[PDB]
């Protein structure tokens with residue numbers, strides 16, 4: 001009973017000084033974060049534990065963000081390269097087989113055709129959205145190419161650009177720092193059990209979830225527009241198939257790999273659609289500590305988002321102060337989603 005021994009054992013494996021830990025429990029009136037009671041932790045010990053917990057949560061969030069961003073980058077590069085190869089090899093197919101087939105009409109105008117495909121590459125890159133036949137006719141059905149090429153290219157470009165926007169939102173949101181009250185609540189969640197005499201106690205799941213939802217609420221606001229974006233990006237792949245399909249059009253300009261990539265992308269995107277609300281449940285998964293002491297955790301789990309954190313017991317959140325960067329990224333999501341929807345619905 002009244003053991004500072006085990007707390008001393010744990011506190012030293014964090015790298016912290018073993019001189020600062022008392023032999024027995026002292027008066028805990030001086031504790032800023034932890035609820036005041038008899039404790040084995042001093043002020044500096046408590047602060048060090050706070051720093052440690054904050055760094056832990058930060059590290060976890062960073063790692064998760066790195067994983068998501070890596071997946072998105074891989075997908076983006078993959079699809080972009082596949083489309084570029086599709087067009088480049090359409091042009092290559094035009095180079096190898098054509099020269100004697102179309103006669104010498106092709107031989108003289110070959111440079112003009114190369115210029116055409118180059119311009120199409122410019123259209124795929126979104127460099128110029130304005131859309132040769134005059135130059136041809138002067139130097140001497142196309143409207144179907146005019147419609148189809150647009151329909152396909154805007155879809156592919158919107159998909160790639162969409163992945164880019166997702167990656168951008170993840171990356172820029174990842175830079176948002178945690179609040180001081182969040183740090184305090186996290187310290188109260190994790191290492192306050194050690195100070196209060198129950199170092200071997202595991203925190204309650206609902207308690208952890210309320211803390212993490214309190215901290216991450218702003219990030220949780222991204223849910224609706226993130227899901228909308230991913231949904232539209234799933235939908236834009238429906239245009240890829242058929243005689244009027246995207247790949248067939250991109251390949252038919254002069255007149256399966258993409259399928260597997262689309263399936264994989266579908267799986268990976270369905271996996272990450274829960275991302276913004278998933279983090280609290282994920283971290284809490286990998287006779288409990290309710291922050292007062294060992295026992296049951298009374299309060300129910302809060303809903304997701306900033307507004308639902310107004311009554312959050314473990315974290316005091318100001319819902320009239322939305323993070324600006326988050327809302328900016330929300331707008332980015334809504335805009336890209338609108339562009340995808342427009343690209344899908346025919347203009």
Ligand SMILES: *[C@@H]1O[C@H](CO)[C@@H](O)[C@H](O)[C@H]1NC(C)=O
Nearest residue numbers: 081084085087088089091121
């Ligand atoms: C595709 O064709 C042109 C040739 O200049 C260019 O965009 C690119 O080098 C080719 N493919 C790649 C990505 O290397």
